[PDB]
Amino acid sequence: ASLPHPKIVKKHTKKFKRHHSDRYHRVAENWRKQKGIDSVVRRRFRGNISQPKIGYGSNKKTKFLSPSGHKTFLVANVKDLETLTMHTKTYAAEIAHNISAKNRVVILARAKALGIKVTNPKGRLALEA
């Protein structure tokens, strides 16, 4: 498969959503810090939402790794894929979103002939059977 690697631990899996993004449509869900002088979220009263902190950060040995155990590298063509030729156990390739189907079949055939895992095969390649 991939390289042997330890168990991956996530200290927080729920998203950090901005306060009152459920009352108003004008308030988006992207995180913004509460800066008001009377804010219960800023003053950290019991029963309110949590805020991002540096203590939540993940282990350096398993950071950026997918559940398979690879790191994702974005690939646009065959030279980009041939960059990853001697690192098939740490990196997995991924075809970019704007590559067409005619070039995706060429990228996938080269990836199979060389041994690189592709995280998104079958994308844009229905009707090929």
Binding site: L74, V75, A76, M86, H87, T90, A96
Partner: protein, 175 residues
């Protein structure tokens, strides 16, 4: 180029472990488990059966026998934490148990190499038991039944099943 390459790559050279310092020493069983003891089975398909303890194996299991004629439990292995040892004892010093080991109960576990009856390919054919197994059962039954004919009601005791009644507190209970 959708991405620029890393300046560094971690090595795909797999490392070896350090020298570990954990040696295997044999089990230290309970002081209520000596061969000849009547045990109560707590889990399994033979729940609540009274069984006779014969031999301690090398994989930390116990060799047990019903006998097969008094309650229908064959020569089996069992785990020592899944059993209750009682204070009744029979004489096991007339039985030869020097042939049973792990390779005796070794099973052809070839189903993990693509079992065509994973669920079932036939759901039938009613698997057959070997004559060597049946003969070992017969000789140990003879040597044990000759000894457990000597105390009264012991055969009836080994035939009957164990169960908890109303108001039976197991922490206050002798066995």
């Amino acid at each position: 180029s959708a991405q620029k390459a890393p300046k560094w790559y971690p090595s795909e050279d797999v490392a070896a472990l350090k020298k570990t310092r954990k040696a295997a020493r044999p089990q230290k069983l309970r002081a209520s488990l000596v061969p000849g003891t009547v045990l109560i089975l707590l889990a399994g398909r033979f729940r609540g059966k009274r069984v006779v303890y014969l031999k301690h194996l090398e994989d930390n299991t116990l060799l047990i026998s019903g006998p097969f004629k008094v309650n229908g439990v064959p020569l089996r292995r069992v785990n020592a934490r899944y059993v209750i040892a009682t204070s009744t004892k029979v004489s096991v010093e007339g039985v030869n148990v020097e042939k049973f080991n792990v390779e005796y109960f070794a099973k052809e576990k070839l189903t993990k190499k693509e079992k065509k009856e994973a669920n079932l390919f036939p759901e039938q054919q009613n698997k057959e038991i070997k004559a060597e197994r049946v003969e070992d059962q017969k000789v140990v039954d003879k040597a044990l039944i000759a000894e457990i004919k000597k105390t009264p009601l012991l055969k009836q005791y080994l035939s009957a099943s164990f169960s908890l009644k109303n108001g039976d507190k197991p922490h206050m209970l002798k066995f």
